[PDB]
């Protein structure tokens, strides 16, 4: 539907599914997976060449994941612009590139005139929605304007009445090109090209369609996995994390440490902290965690895998979760069903405790709550109150029962 290039993963390769059969050359340095993700690295052989058929107002869309700046190389990050995708014929065409937290789209007509349009994301947020996380880019061009959309929403709109005819016949090269660091890479997914200027409506629909999966995602946007170490993030308490309380079978809530060095330009909260959790299947064939799956939520206490429990019979709306070694106790529940109450794209998920798989009886959802001692302290909890709230439309992203799982990732160092 107005699509003239559709790069998708087939048979360990990248193929044009547009119907026009552009040829696609995937060199040895490009890592590929069956989640349609490909990685461009610093290597000379990390490159993709596609040749458009010549017998063919335009738009480019794709998902991208850009690693975090190194806390050592901020100056290079802010100043060294580098190409990722270039499309030049007779010194004319287009090009996407990155300089730090800025992704930029440039045009250059037949005379060599230039305009550009960028999206820059914040590099001082405690928790960022963009840094090293999958997000959706769409770039549209017509007679007068170049617009950039991020996750379906308009972010930039530069005027280009100056810029006229530009050539898009040329070969499209996917390749990191500039004064990049050795460790620089970029992940990309679902690259497409359209012979029309997409509307905000089309772009937002594509965003929802390409977000949908049967499975849950991790904090980074990748599929959520069984048997993999995760730190836990709460979207209703962004700067808080869970820690097993010394000499008590409960998880206390603490405040995240932050970046603690001398840079005017950057700030973030630490992500690799709190207990190392891990999800285990409750069996009834890949390691992907799907919506409505029944799971055990565990964590590592020294060299012991412990488990997250709830009392079967507690009085109030809320009760502190019970953290303890793996064992069968008919005083506690241990089975969790992982949910997705959000209709809209999110990397949040929710955690429901139930009596049994077959029972429609719901105990409550995992969240964070203030409790009174003798003072007032947050604890890792279950609450019955979440049960009605998650049914409300539109879904409430800021609820404490929204959790995200953060595995160690090479795009994020702290």
């Amino acid at each position, epitope marked *: 539907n107005n699509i003239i290039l559709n790069l998708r993963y087939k048979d360990n390769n990248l193929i044009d599914l547009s119907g026009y059969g552009a040829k696609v050359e995937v060199y040895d340095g490009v890592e590929l997976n069956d989640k349609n993700q490909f990685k461009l690295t610093s290597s000379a052989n990390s490159k993709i060449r596609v040749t458009q058929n010549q017998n063919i107002d335009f738009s480019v869309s794709f998902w991208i994941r850009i690693p975090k700046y190194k806390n050592d190389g901020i100056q290079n990050y802010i100043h060294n612009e580098y190409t990722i995708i270039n499309c030049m014929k007779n010194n004319s065409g287009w090009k996407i590139s990155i300089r730090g937290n800025r992704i930029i789209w440039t045009l250059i007509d037949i005379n060599g005139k230039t305009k550009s349009v960028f999206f820059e994301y914040n590099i001082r947020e405690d928790i960022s929605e963009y840094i090293n996380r999958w997000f959706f880019v769409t770039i549209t061009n017509n007679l007068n304007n170049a617009k950039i959309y991020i996750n379906g929403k308009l972010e930039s709109n530069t005027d280009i009445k100056d810029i006229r005819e530009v050539i898009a016949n040329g070969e499209i090269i996917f390749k990191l090109d500039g004064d990049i660091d050795r460790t620089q890479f970029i992940w990309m997914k679902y690259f497409s090209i359209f012979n029309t200027e997409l509307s905000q409506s089309n772009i937002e629909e594509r965003y929802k369609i390409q977000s949908y999966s049967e499975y849950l995602k991790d904090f980074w946007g990748n599929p959520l996995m*069984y048997n*993999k170490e995760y730190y836990m993030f709460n979207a209703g308490n962004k700067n808080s994390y869970i820690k097993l309380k010394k000499d008590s079978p409960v998880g206390e809530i603490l405040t995240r440490s932050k970046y603690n060095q001398n840079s005017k330009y950057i700030n973030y909260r630490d992500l690799y902290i709190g207990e190392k959790f*891990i999800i285990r299947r409750k069996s009834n064939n890949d390691d992907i965690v799907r919506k409505e799956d029944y799971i*055990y939520l565990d964590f590592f206490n020294l*060299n012991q895998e412990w488990r997250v429990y709830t009392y079967k019979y507690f009085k109030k709306e809320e009760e502190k979760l019970f953290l303890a070694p793996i064992s069968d106790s008919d005083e506690f529940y241990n089975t969790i069903q992982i949910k997705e109450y959000d209709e809209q794209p999110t990397y949040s998920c929710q955690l429901l405790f139930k009596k049994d798989e077959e029972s429609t009886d719901e105990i409550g959802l995992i969240g964070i709550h203030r409790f009174y001692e003798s003072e007032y302290k947050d604890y890792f909890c279950i609450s019955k109150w979440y049960l009605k709230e998650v049914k409300r439309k539109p879904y409430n992203l800021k609820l404490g029962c929204n959790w995200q799982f953060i595995p160690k990732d090479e795009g994020w160092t702290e």
Partner: nanobody, 124 residues
Framework: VQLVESGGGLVQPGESLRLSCGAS????????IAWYRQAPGKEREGVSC????????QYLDSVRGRFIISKDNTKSTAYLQMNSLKPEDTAVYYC??????????????????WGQGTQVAVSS
């Protein structure tokens, strides 16, 4: 609630040693047991893992056929039987109690900083 290694020793190539992994405070009836070893200052590596049921075992390729992992629920201890020992087996051995063997080898236990472990050395 402690999970402690013992049975390490100093031996000659070809000889045998038996490590035990003793659980206190809890019971291994629900636990899959993994062994790891770390030589100074090489990369730490997964050595073996036995299932909760005890009917399935996994081995590092370089120890298969020499090492036998087993688990005795009634004693709450699991074992690494090490036969035909070689110099390359020299390491500090650590154990962990897991829900499941899946993914065991790439778990990031900070044994160096809080591990106890038991020392194994092989030299002719």
């Amino acid at each position: 609630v402690q999970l402690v290694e013992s049975g390490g020793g100093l031996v000659q190539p070809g000889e045998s040693l038996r490590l035990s992994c003793g659980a206190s405070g809890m019971s291994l009836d629900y636990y899959a047991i993994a062994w790891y070893r770390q030589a100074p200052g090489k990369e730490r590596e997964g050595v073996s893992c036995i299932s909760v049921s005890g009917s399935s075992a996994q081995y590092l390729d370089s120890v298969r056929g020499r090492f036998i992992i087993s688990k005795d629920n009634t004693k709450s201890t699991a074992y690494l039987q090490m036969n035909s020992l070689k110099p390359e087996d020299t390491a500090v051995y650590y154990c962990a109690a897991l829900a499941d063997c899946a993914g065991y080898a790439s778990l990031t236990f900070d044994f160096d900083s809080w591990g106890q472990g038991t020392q194994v050395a092989v030299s002719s």
